[PDB]
Design a protein around this nucleic acid. Structure first.
Lengths: 94, 80, 98, 107, 54, 94, 81, 98
DNA sequence: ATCAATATCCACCTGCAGATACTACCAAAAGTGTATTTGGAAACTGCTCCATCAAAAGGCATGTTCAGCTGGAATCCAGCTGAACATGCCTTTTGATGGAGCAGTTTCCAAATACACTTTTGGTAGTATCTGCAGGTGGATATTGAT
């Protein structure tokens, strides 16, 4: 009884959102899982470093915002920052 | 044990054609064989280190993925 | 009899192999080479199939990138033939020799 | 009772207790063994002694008695394994290695 | 991006080749993922101008 | 007004061991501190990764040994491994 | 404000930097080119540095921010902490 | 009738002189003004420590020296001794910066 | 083969910034000693995937030939870069000043941890169903290359 968690169903939801009638193979889905894991580890490592530099003991939204700004370029950084900010305000105001 | 002549000359010429090369000298084949053997032993050393640390005998795909990632050559697709 | 001029089949092959995604080395020779190389670090190792598949993907990507760099170093000297000194210059600049 | 420290127990010069504390506080794992700081201290001391011996030989070669960053750079760049361990670092006030291509020389 | 590439090659199902074509053709993605290898991806069709005939 | 720990005195002890009558400037000592910190963080990060891969919760001597082997080349790896092993046996047998 | 200071990197300074690199003969078009390169480099570091400074809610750029930026671009620097 | 060195002599002498030394090769004040101008383009009303600008200077000089070495190699590859912009572009392309 | 003009190295000297050092102290830390808890080593076992043959079958590699075209060597020349001198200008050093911002001190309170409980829910395994696509076949045409 050994499981194996993955982001397959969430990637599938996003795909059905942006392309309602296109599918995806299994190897492309493995590529997408690898991509999500890689970017997650990058952002989390950078935020941990930022928290250590300032002698803080907590990872908050500002650490994630600054890590996003340090990692993504230009268009990507701007739009990701806007998306995350909107998400956090929508979450707290609910 | 010339398993390095297993990489034939037409194979190297195919690899060159994919890279956009239009003409190939005759001394290129030995050079690429040397380069490839260097790269391969560099990767396999760390793969076997990762393996024997875990007290296993079978080299797994994740060991190769880690050995590559530590060289700065991340590889997507075998993360399962 | 019909004969193409030297260089026509070259560009035809270039387009063909840049349109494709296959592997360009045969699998059994590469497997034997990998096992022989691993023979010196530890004896009686086993390999999954996906391990050798990953090694092959990585090696082919590396070599194709090196050949692009070599082609640039060749064109820089006003040639069309790649020679070993172009490979040596590309690797020296990348830092792989230095 | 009488308290002898850990670095003296291991026969080292580097601090074992400080390395233990740095391993704990640095958020690397949730537990830390007893021999890990000893191993790490021994490795760090070995590497420092290697690089310092090379730098001192360079300094005594240029008829000086006191090591400066130039000597550290000359030691690092002249050894294969150090230059390949530290291939991507910049040493302030270090300079470069004297080296002129052969084709640029006259005649 | 990958879906646009897939629909461009008259296909309905994304494969790794389409992911590679999407990544390598965009500046910011190619510069975010400049050091990754996608298995079964291939390369971008590109021949130097000096190698063409005439 | 808070203190600033460093490896100055230990580097000085090692120097007086290998070169009994040579001194060292202050800028070279700053270089040596930077070097020690950098190598420490490298080894500790690699050992943490190794411990995470095997689903272990403890950093032991084997993790440090494997990190040393993965990071240093040839001569350096061999001699560092021998030095650390000797240190650990000397420590436990005391 | 201050504008147009890339010209303060004079031709003799670039010639000296090239001499330390082993270069014997220098084209006349190099200087301009070089300046462009340098500017790009600085813009990539200072940006990162400033991103650290605003994170701590500071207003002065310290040497540690520069060292962190250089390290995160793979250009580690020994001597300043 | 006055003494004149042949072209290339003072250049080699200067190569030896500047490879034997460790000083900085750019004036401090122009570099500081340049750094402040760029920073102002990024965020207004900034300040700087002295060691920060010193670190920036050391890093930038090291970068440019390494680039000039790679450029010299690319130039020698083409059977020249004069470095030209296309060599800088080839070196920066093989390195992976453009 | 010689000579003469320039630049570099070395012996001598000295002023001074820097390394070495107590003294004090002092606060922060490392070591000892228990008690508790839990993660990891040993033992067993099941079952899955890796190594080894067997064995056609045909697609790819190898050796050979011929010829074309490319790389390299040799002249030749012009323009572009180096070397040197005169001028001036702007960087550097030293000192002083204002003062803005950083770092330490204290409060306190909003927010994150730790447990116990309950409800989904996403992931494995069959089990099943359907169909987008890779492989095969025919026919049009786009391109090359010698006349």
């Amino acid at each position: 009884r050994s499981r194996k968690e993955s982001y397959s169903v969430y990637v599938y939801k996003v795909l059905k959102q942006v392309h309602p009638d296109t599918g995806i193979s299994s190897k492309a889905m493995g590529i997408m899982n690898s991509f999500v894991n890689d970017i997650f580890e990058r952002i989390a490592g950078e935020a941990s470093r930022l928290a250590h530099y300032n002698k803080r003991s907590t990872i908050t939204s500002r650490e994630i915002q600054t890590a996003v700004r340090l990692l993504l370029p230009g268009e990507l950084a701007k739009h990701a920052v806007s998306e995350g900010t909107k998400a956090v305000t929508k979450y707290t105001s609910a | 044990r010339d398993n390095i002549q297993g990489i034939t000359k037409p194979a190297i010429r195919r690899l060159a054609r994919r890279g956009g090369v239009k003409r190939i000298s005759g001394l290129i084949y030995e050079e690429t064989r040397g380069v490839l053997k260097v790269f391969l032993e560099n990767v396999i050393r760390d793969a076997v280190t990762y393996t024997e640390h875990a007290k296993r005998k079978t080299v797994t795909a994740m060991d190769v993925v880690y050995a590559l990632k530590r060289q700065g050559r991340t590889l997507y697709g075998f993360g399962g | 009899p019909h004969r193409y001029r030297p260089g026509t089949v070259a560009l035809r092959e270039i387009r063909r192999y840049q349109k494709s995604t296959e592997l360009l080395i045969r699998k059994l020779p590469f497997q034997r080479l990998v096992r022989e190389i691993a023979q010196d670090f530890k004896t009686d190792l086993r390999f999954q199939s996906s391990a050798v598949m990953a090694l092959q993907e990585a090696c082919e990507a590396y070599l194709v990138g090196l050949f692009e760099d070599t082609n640039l170093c060749a064109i820089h000297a006003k040639r069309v033939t790649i020679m070993p000194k172009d490979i040596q210059l590309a690797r020296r600049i990348r830092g792989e020799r230095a | 009772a009488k308290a002898k420290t850990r670095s003296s127990r291991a026969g080292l010069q580097f601090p074992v207790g400080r390395v233990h504390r740095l391993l704990r506080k640095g958020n690397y794992s949730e537990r830390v063994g007893a021999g890990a700081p000893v191993y790490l201290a021994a490795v760090l001391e070995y590497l420092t002694a290697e690089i310092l011996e090379l730098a001192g030989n360079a300094a005594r070669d240029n008829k000086k008695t006191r090591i400066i960053p130039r000597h550290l750079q000359l030691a690092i760049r002249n050894d294969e394994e150090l230059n390949k361990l530290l291939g991507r670092v910049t040493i302030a006030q270090g300079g470069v290695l004297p080296n002129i291509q052969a084709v640029l020389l006259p005649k």
